Design a protein around this ligand. Structure first.
Ligand code: CL
Ligand code: CL
Ligand code: CL
Ligand code: NA
Length: 129
């Protein structure tokens, strides 16, 4: 599924991400924009042979099982395929674990490089929330 901007903001809010670990909704929308372009089916292979999945490009190195990332963990206890669903529940639940692990949203290098410090409220500007 390719979400609209305000559509995704709504679904994130309903799943409890707004202000989760102190990160306003716009942070989460900005990260999804630059990670996936709001496409739940987004995948990207990393140099180490792990893969990033879904709207928030969650990595098989630590967070999900894809059967093809040697030595990896599955800390969200899900198949990585679950992160590709039109329903964002698994991605949001796993993102909450990730952002709680010590580094906040810096886990998402794209958030650090393209969202952190910017006017992230622009990402939810105009949305009925
Ligand atoms: Cl915001
Ligand atoms: Cl594996
Ligand atoms: Cl933090
Ligand atoms: Na894994």
């Amino acid at each position: 599924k390719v979400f609209g901007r305000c559509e995704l903001a709504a679904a994130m809010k309903r799943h409890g991400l707004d202000n989760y670990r102190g990160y306003s909704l716009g942070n989460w929308v900005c990260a999804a924009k630059f990670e996936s372009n709001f496409n739940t089916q987004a995948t990207n292979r990393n140099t180490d042979g792990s893969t990033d999945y879904g709207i928030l490009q969650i990595n098989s190195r630590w967070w999900c099982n894809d059967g093809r990332t040697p030595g990896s963990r599955n800390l969200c206890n899900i198949p990585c395929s679950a992160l590709l669903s039109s329903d964002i529940t698994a991605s949001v639940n796993c993102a909450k674990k990730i952002v709680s692990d010590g580094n906040g949203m810096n886990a998402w290098v794209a958030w650090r490089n393209r969202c952190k410090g910017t006017d992230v409220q622009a990402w939810i500007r105009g949305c009925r929330l």
